[PDB]
Amino acid sequence: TCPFYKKIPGTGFTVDAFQYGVVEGCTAYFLTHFHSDHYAGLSKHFTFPVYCSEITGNLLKNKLHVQEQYIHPLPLDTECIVNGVKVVLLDANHCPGAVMILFYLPNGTVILHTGDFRADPSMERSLLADQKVHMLYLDTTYCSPEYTFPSQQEVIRFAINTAFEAVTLNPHALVVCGTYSIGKEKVFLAIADVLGSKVGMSQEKYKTLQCLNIPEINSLITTDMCSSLVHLLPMMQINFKGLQSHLKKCGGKYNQILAFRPTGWTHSNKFTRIADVIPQTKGNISIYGIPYSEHSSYLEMKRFVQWLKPQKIIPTVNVGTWKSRSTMEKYFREWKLEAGY
Numbered sequence: 001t002c003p004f005y006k007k008i009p010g011t012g013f014t015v016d017a018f019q020y021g022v023v024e025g026c027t028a029y030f031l032t033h034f035h036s037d038h039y040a041g042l043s044k045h046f047t048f049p050v051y052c053s054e055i056t057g058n059l060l061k062n063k064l065h066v067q068e069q070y071i072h073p074l075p076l077d078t079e080c081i082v083n084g085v086k087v088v089l090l091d092a093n094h095c096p097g098a099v100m101i102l103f104y105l106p107n108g109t110v111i112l113h114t115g116d117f118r119a120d121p122s123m124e125r126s127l128l129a130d131q132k133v134h135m136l137y138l139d140t141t142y143c144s145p146e147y148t149f150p151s152q153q154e155v156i157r158f159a160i161n162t163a164f165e166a167v168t169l170n171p172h173a174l175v176v177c178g179t180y181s182i183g184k185e186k187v188f189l190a191i192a193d194v195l196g197s198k199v200g201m202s203q204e205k206y207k208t209l210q211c212l213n214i215p216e217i218n219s220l221i222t223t224d225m226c227s228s229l230v231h232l233l234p235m236m237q238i239n240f241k242g243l244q245s246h247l248k249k250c251g252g253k254y255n256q257i258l259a260f261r262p263t264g265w266t267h268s269n270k271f272t273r274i275a276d277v278i279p280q281t282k283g284n285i286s287i288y289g290i291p292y293s294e295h296s297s298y299l300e301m302k303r304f305v306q307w308l309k310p311q312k313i314i315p316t317v318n319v320g321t322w323k324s325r326s327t328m329e330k331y332f333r334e335w336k337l338e339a340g341y
């Protein structure tokens with residue numbers, strides 16, 4: 001059964017609600033982005049209208065085989081009427097094709113559903129500038145002040161400089177980057193660009209990337225692993241055993257691996273600066289965990305919410321324990337008392 005924080009009152013709509021069967025009263029199912037916890041349940045047998053971005057619709061059609069007649073892509077930053085209700089899709093600064101959804105209810109209420117997002121001051125100059133928001137369905141993944149991490153730009157600077165130094169010292173070093181979902185493509189694209197290489201990967205991952213509308217992508221990626229000195233591998237293989245096994249397969253072309261694991265936050269963020277990050281090393285293999293986040297830090301989340309000034313907040317992450325719920329509610333009240341709304 002579909003939980004309350006996935007339902008939009010006064011409409012026939014749900015958000016990210018595909019794992020509950022036929023939801024009673026739902027006339028249109030919105031999908032914010034192509035991550036498995038959110039799409040859980042979609043397939044070629046789905047026969048209701050799905051509303052989403054262009055990029056998410058390319059992924060539904062090619063990767064899950066949802067039929068075309070049930071895919072309804074909407075352009076971003078554009079007022080659209082869906083089943084008699086005005087909606088707008090906004091870029092969520094999460095993975096490719098991820099949106100937030102503004103719903104203008106028939107009674108005058110305005111609701112913002114963030115989906116998953118990484119808040120940014122640039123959102124303060126979107127179509128959100130123009131009207132009041134009564135209710136905020138908020139991605140609370142990192143809603144506690146311990147959750148700090150650097151900008152995406154600092155993280156990429158670190159990765160490019162680390163990879164270029166290692167391969168210039170040793171032209172026989174291979175770089176490997178882990179992945180298990182869409183998102184974080186800048187990590188492997190930026191490293192391949194500095195090295196003058198295409199990125200090599202499996203046919204299954206190439207297919208996924210080909211759905212993303214990335215400019216000049218045919219110039220950046222390949223399935224010919226032999227031509228490439230940046231390889232993508234499943235995240236599960238980014239360990240000393242999996243990397244050893246991969247280096248054997250490369251036919252003595254290489255004698256060293258440098259590997260990257262983009263994680264979200266890890267407790268090593270509470271002590272160490274990005275500049276000071278060091279790898280784990282065994283022999284000729286070194287693994288870096290890099291804190292490349294596609295979710296808001298605590299401070300980015302707090303700034304956005306204090307700017308938006310919603311009348312009510314409904315968390316969509318960390319909802320399963322009383323302790324998490326009580327912690328999140330305390331921060332929401334602090335924010336409101338400090339800013340005066």
Ligand code: NI
Nearest residue numbers: 033035094116
């Ligand atoms: Ni996500």
